[PDB]
Design a protein around this ligand. Structure first.
Ligand code: CDL
Lengths: 57, 77
């Protein structure tokens, strides 16, 4: 009735703060893993050059 | 021989019931050393070294309800 409730009450703030920090850490890790991917595709100039070779020009 | 008597804490028991039906933080403890046995970090004990906390707190509460209030005249320990 008295002791355990008082100690739980004393615990509450630190746990709340630590859990808030943990959530912010999760969000930060989520953000840090985002990178914009740039893909390289075969230049069409080579395709045009090959077309010329097929044209036998 | 069996003697039937009562402790002198009935009013204090009533006050405890009245004032502690709701939770309240405790920050001042007469014997605080029972909660901090290890002062150097990375030291840990496999023995149940925190088993004495509950008994310590209850004993402090009981002995304080008796001794401190015994200063009031006619109060009985
Ligand atoms: C022959 C004559 C009669 C006597 C017979 C005795 C037989 C003895 C057999 C042999 C025994 C040998 C060994 C003895 C060793 C003694 C050692 C000793 O005393 O050490 C001191 C030591 C002192 O302790 P303490 O620190 O004072 O704390 C104990 C307190 O009880 C307070 O501690 P606590 O607050 O932590 O306790 C918990 C408390 C938590 O708090 C509460 O619950 C609050 C209430 C507290 C009650 C207890 C305190 C009593 C206060 C004084 C008496 C109150 C008024 C009585 C009025 C009587 C009028 C005549 O809860 C309770 O007490 C639960 C009981 C609640 C009862 C509620 C009843 C409601 C009824 C409602 C009815 C409504 C009807 C409506 C109808 C409508 C119709 C239209 O005593 C003890 O530790 C207890 C000793 C008990 C030993 C067992 C004895 C055997 C059982 C006997 C029962 C007799 C019943 C019949 C009686 C009939 C009337 C005459």
């Amino acid at each position: 009735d008295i002791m355990v409730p008082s100690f739980v009450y004393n615990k509450l703030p630190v746990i709340h703060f630590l859990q808030e920090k943990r959530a912010e850490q999760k969000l930060r890790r989520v953000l840090d893993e985002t990178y914009t991917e740039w893909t390289e595709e075969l230049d069409q100039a080579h395709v045009t050059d090959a077309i010329t070779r097929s044209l036998n020009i | 021989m069996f003697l039937f008597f009562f402790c002198d804490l009935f009013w204090l028991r009533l006050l405890l019931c009245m004032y502690y039906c709701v939770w309240s933080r405790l920050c001042f403890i007469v014997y605080f050393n029972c909660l901090m046995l290890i002062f150097d970090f990375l030291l840990f004990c496999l023995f149940d070294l925190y088993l004495f906390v509950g008994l310590c707190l209850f004993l402090l509460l009981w002995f304080m309800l008796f001794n401190l209030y015994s200063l009031i005249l006619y109060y009985c320990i």
